Amino acid sequence: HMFDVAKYLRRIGVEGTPPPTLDTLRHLHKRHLMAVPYDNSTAPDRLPASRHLTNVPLDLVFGHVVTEGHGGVCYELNRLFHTLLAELGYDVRMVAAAVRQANGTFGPEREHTFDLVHLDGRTHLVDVGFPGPSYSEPLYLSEEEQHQYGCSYRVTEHDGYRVVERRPKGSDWQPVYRFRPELADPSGWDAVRLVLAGTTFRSRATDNGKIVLIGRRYFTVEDGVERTKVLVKADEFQDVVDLILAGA
């Protein structure tokens, strides 16, 4: 009952109650990724003993992300965004995906959680909860090449999966994640199941790209041009954390 559309829209820098159109969806998606960073720093603290996402009240996640201004992980940010989109009138369907790993395999089948929106006879992929380099505006569910912010995307079909692939400037196509579109479900969020500190993941979009910090590995993409640096200095590291977490 604490979920509040207006409070959320203010949190992401969106004015009024914009109309339920594709132009609005594209704006909401980009603004969310600019304003609400991905952060797994305290994700373990919000896990339920039961392993069922339903047992984590939506208001707890809303309070952490929206009221308090923090970031979150895929099943927090996309869960909130699904609810916002539904309250703004969109036909939103939850989907789970397997993420491409550094070694080229795909990880567990339902590790990543995101959404699809069916609008005006076309289906769009919606994902404001993915740590690494990926799309700032929704993709169409199509193998046709799509272009945004200096990168290309396509959603190909391979062996019963749809595969989101990305190509920045000067690089080859690489998969991001894969999913089974036919398992999309309007109510799918209800079915989700969940020493040095573990590796921290933090990122957010910028006006023309994205900034990503994975451990010490700092990545930026600006109009499709990528740069990476392994951070050594503690002060520089903290400056990058602060820049990500401050939003835009």
Numbering used by the authors: 0 to 193, 204 to 257
Give me lines lifted from the publication on this model.
Amide synthases catalyze the formation of macrolactam rings from aniline-containing polyketide-derived seco-acids as found in the important class of ansamycin antibiotics. A key enzyme is the amide synthase ShGdmF (hereafter abbreviated as GdmF), which is not part of the PKS and is thought to catalyze the release of the ketide chain from the acyl carrier protein (ACP) domain of the last module 7 of the polyketide synthase. The overall folding of GdmF largely resembles the common architecture of its NAT analog, revealing a three-domain architecture with an N-terminal α-helical bundle (domain I, residues 1–88), a β-barrel (domain II, residues 89–185), and a C-terminal α/β-lid (domain III, residues 211–257), the latter being connected to domain II via an interdomain region (residues 186–210). The catalytic triad (Cys73-His111-Asp126 in GdmF) is highly conserved with an rmsd of 0.04 Å compared to the catalytic domain of MlNAT1 and is buried deep in the large active site cleft between domains II and III.
The substrate-bound protein structures agree well with the ligand-free structure of GdmF, with rmsd values between 0.05 and 0.137 Å for all backbone atoms, indicating only minor spatial changes within the subdomains upon substrate binding. To our surprise, we could not find electron density for the different thioester groups in any of these structures, but we found densities for the cleaved SNAC or pantetheine groups, instead. The SNAC and pantetheine groups are deeply embedded in the wide active site cleft, with the sulfur atom of the sulfhydryl group at a distance of only about 2 Å away from the reactive cysteine Cys73. GdmF, therefore, appears to be capable of directly binding SNAC and pantetheine thioesters and catalyzing the first step of macrolactamization, i.e., initiating nucleophilic attack of the activated ester carbon by the thiol group of Cys73 and thus cleavage of the thioester in the absence of arylamines. The bound SNAC and pantetheine co-substrates show conserved binding positions within the active site aligned with the β-strands of domains II and III. Two stabilizing interactions of the sulfur atom in the thioesters are observed with Tyr37 and His111. Although the orientation of the SNAC units within the hydrophobic active site cleft is the same for the different thioester derivatives, two alternative conformations of the acetamido group were observed, one of which forms an additional hydrogen bond to Gly110. This flexibility reflects the predominantly hydrophobic nature of the interactions with aliphatic and aromatic residues in the active site (Val72, Tyr74, Val98, Phe129, Pro130, and Phe210), and is consistent with mostly hydrophobic amino acids surrounding the catalytic triad in known NATs25. The SNAC (Kd = 1.16 mM) and pantetheine (Kd = 1.32 mM) prosthetic arms exerted comparable binding strengths in the low millimolar range.
